[PDB]
């Protein structure tokens, strides 16, 4: 509950106030999903419930596919431009 | 125009070989002012192109034969107009 | 304090033993060219990256989905008895749907490296 | 053709009566006729000196302790020019063997730290006395002895005390001896100056970074020694080789970090603590910053005006800021290119992923 | 086929001094433009102005030649050297053959009159 | 000896804050990816702590083993320029950063309780004082673990989401080929 909210909020702030990278944006998205999954699994343990763990493993799969697609899109952007700069997405 | 001739006239006297230290003017011939010989007129255009952060082609660098032609070439915004 | 825990902590906080032995025992008096890197070789301030073929990155991008497929098969092999003849059919449908994408991957030839400087195969025809 | 830039003539007579007729134009296969003995040839200044001597065929005798530290000297000359002898200052036959056949003897022996077997006295005074008595017994024509700057008989630092006492016993035993007083020598693979400034994780000074000296390039000191070797004008004289411009350690560190484009770390913690830390680190076997060095951190260079200088040798030194680039550029990182804006639209025209 | 390298120029002997004039001036331009590359590739301990001074010196060496074919040969060898320098084929050792002035002073006694050379047996 | 391992959840929370700060702060993004890996390690630890080591190992083999690998794979192959964390560039964010930190954290801790009065909604979130009793029953006769039950429900009670995740993975194959590859004809 605490670790997850903290990771989520700090990842959201490091996404919003990123004037540096695009890799940091990717990282902050992945860490946000991590934080949600940790809150989810703590509640799964406390309630003794499987729906939380099911949703968590589904999030793992979906986040993997998200990463794959995002890093294909970045590769198209780089096909055309050749350099991924500090700004301009 | 006052963007560029400032730095042109600066680099022309940065070039030591000019007998004069202050004969540089627009309408100054690179050659028959006798400030320069033929190699120096490539040295000076080289100094100018890497002053303005550019590189001039070969048919326009031979054509830059006086301080008129220099400023009017840099006038095309190749970079650092 | 179990032997598992002892081993898995001990390996990291001891692994630098020979590192320190080597740092303290061995000479260190560098040169410029001993800090160098090669027989010949150089590169001006041209770029920071080389152009790469698509397959080089596509193998990595496709490792993710196939790895997730094979890892999603773990619940099945740990549930195989309890899901008797129903989950079997379900995971077979799963595997077939995921084999369709593999078929697509093969038929597109996405991991193939293509060659630019082709060998000329066109006839020599002389206008008379 | 090559030339004998070190000699003014080709027929040279020594002060002991030997006639030396130079053979050749001045290359590797040439010979000056001279024989020399450089006692600290393994080291920093000695390597350059032996290189300059053997470039023209001066037969250098190199007394050595470690067989492996000397090997780079054999490349400096042709076959039969560089000759090796195993030596210890606790063996007089060694020193006599080293100085027997020589016309020039150069003592460059000195440690900046004390060891189990050699204190500052045993290396700077007694070793100098042993070499000087060999030089007197064999009537060697020229003896050229290097004593560090700011040498003074009674001084705060034991290094300078012992160096001055050496500079006295040499002059008292061998009156025709030349004493060369170099200032802090900088260069490539230097001992404690620039390589140390550029590699050290943190510099320390008991004083402020405020000791002042005129630093000099090691190659120019070697050149001055080369000129002193063949100039018989220089007997019974003293030389203060110090260099053109004055600097503080803080100024030199500022220069180093401006060249290096990296922020050199310095601490400036007190004397009673750093001196004890140094005194403790002498217990390990490898060289470290000695307590007498942090004593010398309070002793700026006092140049003797009665002593000769570079200009008596027709030499004009370099000074540190023009050579700092050459010397420190190996440690320059060169992080990235400048202002990759204005690269976008030109980069757009190239192919970055090949289909 | 066997294709040429990066900065190759087909050997073409001008039949005119006025064309070889333009060719030589272009080569001078190229050397001057490439001097920063010569300082970056070869770890040079001196100025880019010094490199350009040396280029100008070597171009002045053959300034008052009038035989056309000799000038053609000199242009061809100059372009060979440009291709050898800009493409990192030379090493620092061969590049610094052009720069003996930048290395430290070679000893004390460098004769310029008769008696010096006589005492050193160079007259 | 008993309570030497008591604060191992708090230590993970602290280390997670640290690793997020290092992610935001690292100069080279490769270092940011490595700190993301360290954060995954910390999360996997915490998951072992609360009794879900299966998820810890799944995380190690999926996130660190594939996703972080692909991140490193792309930054090794692509030019990703970076502006360093600066005071002339980022200090303007401090007022909004602090306001948002306070607001978002407090709302995230308030959202989990059903009490009507707003201040009490945070005070219940910080009410982690009393321990849970773990009694033992004898009704579970089988050796069913968390992975077995995940498989059971995912292949029987929730077969549809598995057979939809199949199409999600098909996208994961078919999209990147459409975007990265160029078909001849
Ligand atoms: N470098 C500087 O900044 C300054 C140096 N000097 C003096 O000038 C000379 C230059 O030496 P440096 O250039 O510093 O490089 P080194 O000081 O490394 O040269 C040291 C030489 O002394 C020899 N040596 C030391 N102790 C003994 C010993 N007990 N018995 C025999 N040989 C010994 C070493 O032999 P091995 O290599 O076998 O140990 C080495 O050849 C020294 O006299 C030094 O004191 C003066 C002022 C500044
Ligand atoms: C213990 C290992 C560390 C030794 C050490 O570190 O001891 C090193 C000391 C220091 O010698 P130094 O003359 O002052 O070095 C000179 C240079 N300085 C001033 C920079 C330091 O050796 C002595 O004083 C004499 C002790 C001899 C020890 C020999 C025993 C070796 C056996 C090794 C068994 C494995």
PDB file of C-alpha atoms and ligand atoms in Angstrom, chain D residues 39-46 63-66 69 87-89 107-113 115 118 122-124 146-149 159 163 182-186 191-193 218, ligand 1:
ATOM      1  CA  UNK D  39      73.378   6.547 -11.464  1.00  0.00           C
ATOM      2  CA  UNK D  40      69.604   7.108 -11.511  1.00  0.00           C
ATOM      3  CA  UNK D  41      69.069   6.176 -15.142  1.00  0.00           C
ATOM      4  CA  UNK D  42      66.102   3.894 -14.398  1.00  0.00           C
ATOM      5  CA  UNK D  43      64.011   6.832 -13.255  1.00  0.00           C
ATOM      6  CA  UNK D  44      62.174   9.869 -14.514  1.00  0.00           C
ATOM      7  CA  UNK D  45      64.923  12.349 -15.392  1.00  0.00           C
ATOM      8  CA  UNK D  46      67.568   9.678 -15.893  1.00  0.00           C
ATOM      9  CA  UNK D  63      74.057   1.073 -12.724  1.00  0.00           C
ATOM     10  CA  UNK D  64      70.817  -0.697 -11.865  1.00  0.00           C
ATOM     11  CA  UNK D  65      69.123  -2.532  -9.017  1.00  0.00           C
ATOM     12  CA  UNK D  66      66.023  -4.079 -10.628  1.00  0.00           C
ATOM     13  CA  UNK D  69      63.027  -1.433 -14.645  1.00  0.00           C
ATOM     14  CA  UNK D  87      74.866  -1.878  -8.233  1.00  0.00           C
ATOM     15  CA  UNK D  88      74.087  -1.223  -4.599  1.00  0.00           C
ATOM     16  CA  UNK D  89      75.321   1.724  -2.554  1.00  0.00           C
ATOM     17  CA  UNK D 107      74.388  11.312  -9.662  1.00  0.00           C
ATOM     18  CA  UNK D 108      70.611  11.520 -10.019  1.00  0.00           C
ATOM     19  CA  UNK D 109      70.005   9.293  -6.989  1.00  0.00           C
ATOM     20  CA  UNK D 110      67.334  10.404  -4.556  1.00  0.00           C
ATOM     21  CA  UNK D 111      64.152   9.241  -2.829  1.00  0.00           C
ATOM     22  CA  UNK D 112      61.232  11.385  -1.703  1.00  0.00           C
ATOM     23  CA  UNK D 113      60.515   8.869   1.080  1.00  0.00           C
ATOM     24  CA  UNK D 115      62.667   3.100   3.474  1.00  0.00           C
ATOM     25  CA  UNK D 118      67.722   3.820   3.334  1.00  0.00           C
ATOM     26  CA  UNK D 122      71.746   7.174   3.834  1.00  0.00           C
ATOM     27  CA  UNK D 123      70.619   7.976   0.284  1.00  0.00           C
ATOM     28  CA  UNK D 124      71.272  11.714  -0.015  1.00  0.00           C
ATOM     29  CA  UNK D 146      71.665  16.815  -8.741  1.00  0.00           C
ATOM     30  CA  UNK D 147      70.387  18.315  -5.478  1.00  0.00           C
ATOM     31  CA  UNK D 148      66.743  19.276  -5.093  1.00  0.00           C
ATOM     32  CA  UNK D 149      65.595  22.889  -4.937  1.00  0.00           C
ATOM     33  CA  UNK D 159      64.781  16.009   2.601  1.00  0.00           C
ATOM     34  CA  UNK D 163      70.173  17.231   0.135  1.00  0.00           C
ATOM     35  CA  UNK D 182      66.177  21.447 -10.344  1.00  0.00           C
ATOM     36  CA  UNK D 183      62.792  22.798  -9.390  1.00  0.00           C
ATOM     37  CA  UNK D 184      59.664  20.588  -9.390  1.00  0.00           C
ATOM     38  CA  UNK D 185      59.868  18.640 -12.627  1.00  0.00           C
ATOM     39  CA  UNK D 186      56.708  17.971 -14.620  1.00  0.00           C
ATOM     40  CA  UNK D 191      56.332  11.305 -10.012  1.00  0.00           C
ATOM     41  CA  UNK D 192      54.127  13.557  -7.863  1.00  0.00           C
ATOM     42  CA  UNK D 193      52.898  16.570  -9.904  1.00  0.00           C
ATOM     43  CA  UNK D 218      61.909  17.371 -17.339  1.00  0.00           C
TER      44      UNK D 218
HETATM   45  N1  LIG G   1      61.189  14.589  -9.732  1.00  0.00           N
HETATM   46  C1  LIG G   1      61.212  15.837  -9.135  1.00  0.00           C
HETATM   47  O1  LIG G   1      60.169  16.488  -9.166  1.00  0.00           O
HETATM   48  C2  LIG G   1      62.424  16.338  -8.503  1.00  0.00           C
HETATM   49  C3  LIG G   1      63.516  15.541  -8.417  1.00  0.00           C
HETATM   50  N2  LIG G   1      64.673  15.970  -7.823  1.00  0.00           N
HETATM   51  C4  LIG G   1      65.890  15.113  -7.720  1.00  0.00           C
HETATM   52  O2  LIG G   1      66.403  14.872  -9.014  1.00  0.00           O
HETATM   53  C5  LIG G   1      66.648  13.471  -9.179  1.00  0.00           C
HETATM   54  C6  LIG G   1      65.505  12.948 -10.049  1.00  0.00           C
HETATM   55  O3  LIG G   1      64.995  11.754  -9.613  1.00  0.00           O
HETATM   56  P1  LIG G   1      63.340  11.716 -10.271  1.00  0.00           P
HETATM   57  O4  LIG G   1      63.493  12.385 -11.577  1.00  0.00           O
HETATM   58  O5  LIG G   1      62.563  12.354  -9.141  1.00  0.00           O
HETATM   59  O6  LIG G   1      62.907  10.236 -10.632  1.00  0.00           O
HETATM   60  P2  LIG G   1      63.362   9.188  -9.466  1.00  0.00           P
HETATM   61  O7  LIG G   1      63.385  10.047  -8.255  1.00  0.00           O
HETATM   62  O8  LIG G   1      62.399   8.049  -9.594  1.00  0.00           O
HETATM   63  O9  LIG G   1      64.874   8.670  -9.793  1.00  0.00           O
HETATM   64  C7  LIG G   1      65.191   7.919  -8.697  1.00  0.00           C
HETATM   65  C8  LIG G   1      66.460   7.181  -8.939  1.00  0.00           C
HETATM   66  O10 LIG G   1      67.146   7.038  -7.718  1.00  0.00           O
HETATM   67  C9  LIG G   1      67.496   5.685  -7.616  1.00  0.00           C
HETATM   68  N3  LIG G   1      67.639   5.380  -6.207  1.00  0.00           N
HETATM   69  C10 LIG G   1      66.851   5.815  -5.167  1.00  0.00           C
HETATM   70  N4  LIG G   1      67.232   5.364  -3.975  1.00  0.00           N
HETATM   71  C11 LIG G   1      68.334   4.594  -4.262  1.00  0.00           C
HETATM   72  C12 LIG G   1      69.177   3.862  -3.451  1.00  0.00           C
HETATM   73  N5  LIG G   1      68.952   3.837  -2.116  1.00  0.00           N
HETATM   74  N6  LIG G   1      70.223   3.163  -3.946  1.00  0.00           N
HETATM   75  C13 LIG G   1      70.363   3.245  -5.296  1.00  0.00           C
HETATM   76  N7  LIG G   1      69.649   3.901  -6.215  1.00  0.00           N
HETATM   77  C14 LIG G   1      68.610   4.589  -5.653  1.00  0.00           C
HETATM   78  C15 LIG G   1      66.318   4.909  -8.280  1.00  0.00           C
HETATM   79  O11 LIG G   1      66.677   3.671  -8.586  1.00  0.00           O
HETATM   80  P3  LIG G   1      65.253   2.549  -8.562  1.00  0.00           P
HETATM   81  O12 LIG G   1      64.580   3.080  -9.787  1.00  0.00           O
HETATM   82  O13 LIG G   1      66.023   1.271  -8.690  1.00  0.00           O
HETATM   83  O14 LIG G   1      64.589   2.840  -7.215  1.00  0.00           O
HETATM   84  C16 LIG G   1      66.089   5.804  -9.492  1.00  0.00           C
HETATM   85  O15 LIG G   1      66.971   5.444 -10.501  1.00  0.00           O
HETATM   86  C17 LIG G   1      66.681  12.912  -7.749  1.00  0.00           C
HETATM   87  O16 LIG G   1      67.912  13.228  -7.210  1.00  0.00           O
HETATM   88  C18 LIG G   1      65.617  13.712  -7.081  1.00  0.00           C
HETATM   89  O17 LIG G   1      65.814  13.815  -5.718  1.00  0.00           O
HETATM   90  C19 LIG G   1      64.727  17.249  -7.309  1.00  0.00           C
HETATM   91  C20 LIG G   1      63.693  18.075  -7.360  1.00  0.00           C
HETATM   92  C21 LIG G   1      62.414  17.699  -7.965  1.00  0.00           C
END
